[PDB]
Design a binder for this molecule. Structure first.
Ligand SMILES: CC(=O)N[C@@H]1[C@@H](O)[C@H](O[C@@H]2O[C@H](CO)[C@@H](O[C@@H]3O[C@H](CO[C@H]4O[C@H](CO)[C@@H](O)[C@H](O)[C@@H]4O[C@@H]4O[C@H](CO)[C@@H](O)[C@H](O)[C@H]4NC(C)=O)[C@@H](O)[C@H](O[C@H]4O[C@H](CO)[C@@H](O)[C@H](O)[C@@H]4O[C@@H]4O[C@H](CO)[C@@H](O)[C@H](O)[C@H]4NC(C)=O)[C@@H]3O)[C@H](O)[C@H]2NC(C)=O)[C@@H](CO)O[C@H]1NC(=O)C[C@H](N)C(=O)O
Ligand SMILES: CC(=O)N[C@@H]1[C@@H](O)[C@H](O[C@@H]2O[C@H](CO)[C@@H](O[C@@H]3O[C@H](CO[C@H]4O[C@H](CO)[C@@H](O)[C@H](O)[C@@H]4O[C@@H]4O[C@H](CO)[C@@H](O)[C@H](O)[C@H]4NC(C)=O)[C@@H](O)[C@H](O[C@H]4O[C@H](CO)[C@@H](O)[C@H](O)[C@@H]4O[C@@H]4O[C@H](CO)[C@@H](O)[C@H](O)[C@H]4NC(C)=O)[C@@H]3O)[C@H](O)[C@H]2NC(C)=O)[C@@H](CO)O[C@H]1NC(=O)C[C@H](N)C(=O)O
Ligand SMILES: Nc1nc2c(ncn2[C@@H]2O[C@H](COP(=O)(O)OP(=O)(O)O)[C@@H](O)[C@H]2O)c(=O)[nH]1
Lengths: 467, 453
């Protein structure tokens, strides 16, 4: 049986889109009869009117996802799936006889920062899960804390943290290492041979439930291992608890990560605070349609300690929540200390706890916070805006989309598409167009983002029925 | 549980709308820095890209309405509601004792065209249904046929078609006529007193189920009496079948009705919406031939349409050798059978066709485009809307609105703005159409529980 509110909202979304289309044709015809001041004046009003109209449509779509008991079901199903995966990971990590268990050894000391190192451990963990090997994490001489993983986080196992085994060797494939008890896994950047237990694929035994519950099952699958990893030590839980109080961290709140310093060189670009705040302002307007928002709170995480004073001045109607001492210690000089390790764990924690995350996905810091966020809600796939890259996991397999609508290129920078063409996406320009390659042609260029759908990849993982 | 396709479709509608907003902000910013011919070319290309993008969203929204067995449920529920009402109407129309039954007499000979006369009979029928009086239809001296109503349609009753009784009077109110057996009802144009059994209200006992199934319950309620009235005689049934074969009426097909003897609209004003909707249909089905059923009172229009749109196939009953009443009935039939209806709702004939169309699908309320008026029923009570989002007037022609304000709508300008009066402020002007919702009116009708036995 269909719900009454479900049908009212569906038809209102249809009529709102139709009316928006009536509005677009009428106003665009008027616009091309203008030039100079009048053209700029009316197009600005046109854009303002369109914004509210578009957000009313987005608000009805939000209500549609909650009506008819769908919100409670999606919450229950996401909770059941999380507990299913966590129990499997815990069973894998705690065999009865550690001296006889197949193992995978991971070294945390990758030459990069915390988020990059955390994603290395995640990649180790997912391959360990894929091969039914207990993850052994070797973290001594960790650049952030010489005492290792247990300085901040609980150990990845309770019964089996020892590397003992009758045979040991470097990774050389799941079939060749079939009878090697202890396999050491290197970093993903030069792994050969690559096993299938890599992003962005998900387990096929969970895929049907995931696509039904979650808008990007790839990130959800990655987040399950992030969730298991960052179980905090008791002293760290209390720091997080204390910081939440002293920071005045309450909802609604939008998280903003401004990555600079050594990233601006080659891995990303410099972005003014205005580029972040336009999306912060836009999302608070959306929230104000469904809830009361008296104070617009922004948790600002950044490695530029001069940004907080700048943001408070240029956006005085916002309440910025930030730890400027953490920002200062994030500088390349004082970056690899236990106090700085606490700082980045705290910054990522509050970013992940926000109701919306504005940042650059080229930074591993924001990707981690976006992954953790997936463990805090039934489906937080779209609660982000990245100023550059789409979501990715470094070392992932080819991220492919499928063309659903044909495209004939208007300029030379666009690529043709036929329905069914596999499209290897490179990025979303957030202007209606995405850049990628057509795997029937080899051509790279732009194409309308709405003319493709995400190709969900699946992999036959072990299901751990004993758990 | 939730449906996998339902969630996939909702999220794609969400992301499709989000990408549309990305596309709008980018191209409009570029559009401000243009002038002259380059502005015209980019604005025209902008509109073309927006069209296909908008239709992808609407297509996903159509699929959403169908998945998870929702299409089957809506068809079954719309069927149950129709059978329920038709069973009640049939019970009312066929009492056991005609000489003792309470009646309402309706004269079909209103001074207007066929479509307006049919609506007069509908308005009679709805009041008869409201007052539990058997409708007696008088069709002698009908300008369209000497033999009367039954030359085309079945009699409105099988057991009670005379006006016998103990007392007869003109309409004076349901309470005053409590003991008048046979009440004669005049046209609605000067009816006094007006009863509550009038559009656009729906029966309160059906309102909840109707809102769930149908996008415009008012026209659905009107269409039930249209459906009962136009039950065809066997020979009209065969003429319709013969006309269908000879014309090659097949689906998909869009109906176009062009009335021209009040205001003049050239054929291009109709065809732009015809072409737009065939582009929509082409996204969900194969469209080999773009067929258009053209109903017109203009002999030069059909040749104009064929000349200007040579890739279209135009169909009209002028192709039929054996065909005023027969012509308008066939026109109404084929227009109502179409997948989409482009016309002017100021025409009574198109309104009839739009109403019949509601009886052929679970929810066809939106399968139209009107060049002028929104749907109405002549003689209806005030059509009111409720403002849902505030509006600050941007020009002198716009009116303010606060959430909750009752808005008496005068029409939709099909440009994003509707025209009406804000009753809280006594001000009349323009307002964005998306900032209001329809105010569904209900009336306590009889429910005829004896019709279930
Ligand atoms: C040995 C070691 O220790 N290495 C350390 C690294 O591991 C650390 O991390 C790496 O940091 C890099 C830089 O941030 C990361 O690169 C980014 O990778 C993105 C992912 O690319 C994937 O997926 C894309 C789809 O999203 C796809 O298009 C790519 O082709 C790529 O996919 C391939 O696909 C193969 C199948 O086809 C598959 O087999 C491969 O496995 C897969 N590769 C990976 C890595 O998964 C990528 O999207 C980024 O690209 C953008 O940015 C650069 C500038 O940095 C631009 O040049 C690019 O054009 C691209 O621009 C983007 O383009 C979009 C389209 O227009 C646009 O919208 C975006 O805005 C724009 N982005 C901009 C402008 O910023 C980029 O290449 C890499 O993923 C990280 N790897 C891991 C494992 O985490 C690294 C951290 O700093 O540190 C290294 N350590 C050292 O160097 C140690 C040092 N030597 C020492 O001191 O000792
Ligand atoms: C005695 C006899 O037999 N008479 C015959 C008539 O009965 C036949 O039918 C009547 O035809 C009229 C002409 O087409 C119809 O009038 C139209 O009615 C429209 C509906 O008005 C409703 O609903 C509106 C909302 O949609 C609302 O705004 C209106 O105010 C009106 O509502 C009132 O509401 C009251 C409560 O407040 C309620 O008590 C009343 O009962 C109710 N009235 C009715 C009638 O229901 C109306 O929208 C039409 O108006 C548009 O068109 C006229 C031009 O005709 C314009 O001047 C208007 O401004 C308006 O324009 C529209 O404006 C919109 C806003 O900008 C815009 O979007 C539209 O595009 C635009 N449309 C245009 C320009 O076309 C119009 O008034 C009437 O409803 C019919 N009545 C019935 C019962 O069917 C008639 C036709 O066959 O024939 C008569 N017979 C003869 O003439 C023969 C003669 N006696 C002889 O020669 O012998
Ligand atoms: N506390 C804190 N630390 C940061 C911030 N931005 C960068 N850092 C530090 O700089 C390191 C950057 O390494 P990585 O995690 O790979 O992030 P990436 O360089 O942006 O890809 C982080 O691990 C942090 O130690 C920030 O906003 N807050």
């Amino acid at each position: 049986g269909l719900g009454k509110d479900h049908e009212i909202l569906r038809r209102r979304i249809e009529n709102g889109a139709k009316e928006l289309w009536f509005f677009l044709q009428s106003e665009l015809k008027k616009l091309k009869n203008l030039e100079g001041n009048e053209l700029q004046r009316h197009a600005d009003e046109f854009l303002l009117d369109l914004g509210h109209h578009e957000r009313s449509i987005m608000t009805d779509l939000y209500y549609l996802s909650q009506t008819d008991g769908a919100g409670d079901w999606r919450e229950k199903e996401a909770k059941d799936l999380t507990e299913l995966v966590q129990r499997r990971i815990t069973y894998l990590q705690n065999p009865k006889d550690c001296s006889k268990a197949k193992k995978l050894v991971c070294n945390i000391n990758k030459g990069c920062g915390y988020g990059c190192q955390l994603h290395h451990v995640v990649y180790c963990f997912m391959i360990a899960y894929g091969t039914q090997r207990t993850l052994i994490l070797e973290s001594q001489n960790w650049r952030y804390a010489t005492g290792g993983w247990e300085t901040v986080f609980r150990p990845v196992s309770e019964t089996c943290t020892d590397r003992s085994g009758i045979s040991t060797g470097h990774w050389s494939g799941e079939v060749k290492d079939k009878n090697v008890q202890v396999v050491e896994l290197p970093i993903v950047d030069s792994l050969h041979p690559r096993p299938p237990y890599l992003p962005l694929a998900v387990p096929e035994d969970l895929a049907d439930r995931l696509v039904r519950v979650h808008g990007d099952p790839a990130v959800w699958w990655v987040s399950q291992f992030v969730k298991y990893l960052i179980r905090p030590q008791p002293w760290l839980e209390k720091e997080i608890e204390e910081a939440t109080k002293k920071l005045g961290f309450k909802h609604p709140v939008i998280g903003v990560h401004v990555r600079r310093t050594d990233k601006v060189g080659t891995e990303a670009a410099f972005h003014p605070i205005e580029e972040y705040m336009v999306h912060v302002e836009e999302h608070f307007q959306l929230l104000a349609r469904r809830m009361q928002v008296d104070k617009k709170r922004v948790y600002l995480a950044t490695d530029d300690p001069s940004l907080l004073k700048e943001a408070k001045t240029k956006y005085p109607n916002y309440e910025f929540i930030s730890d400027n001492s953490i920002s200062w210690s994030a500088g390349l000089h004082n970056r690899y200390t236990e106090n700085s390790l606490r700082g980045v764990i705290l910054d990522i924690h509050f970013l992940s706890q926000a109701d919306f995350l504005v940042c650059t996905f080229s930074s591993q810091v924001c990707r981690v916070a976006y992954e953790i966020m997936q463990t805090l809600h039934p489906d937080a796939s779209a609660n982000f805006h990245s100023l550059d890259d789409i979501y990715y996991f470094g070392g992932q397999n080819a991220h492919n989309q499928i063309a659903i609508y044909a495209h004939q290129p208007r300029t030379a920078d666009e690529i043709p598409m036929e329905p069914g063409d596999i499209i290897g996406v490179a990025g979303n320009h957030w202007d209606g167009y995405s850049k990628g390659v057509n795997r029937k042609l080899g051509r790279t260029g732009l194409y309308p983002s709405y003319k493709v759908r995400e190709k969900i990849e699946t992999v036959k993982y072990p299901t751990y029925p004993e758990a």
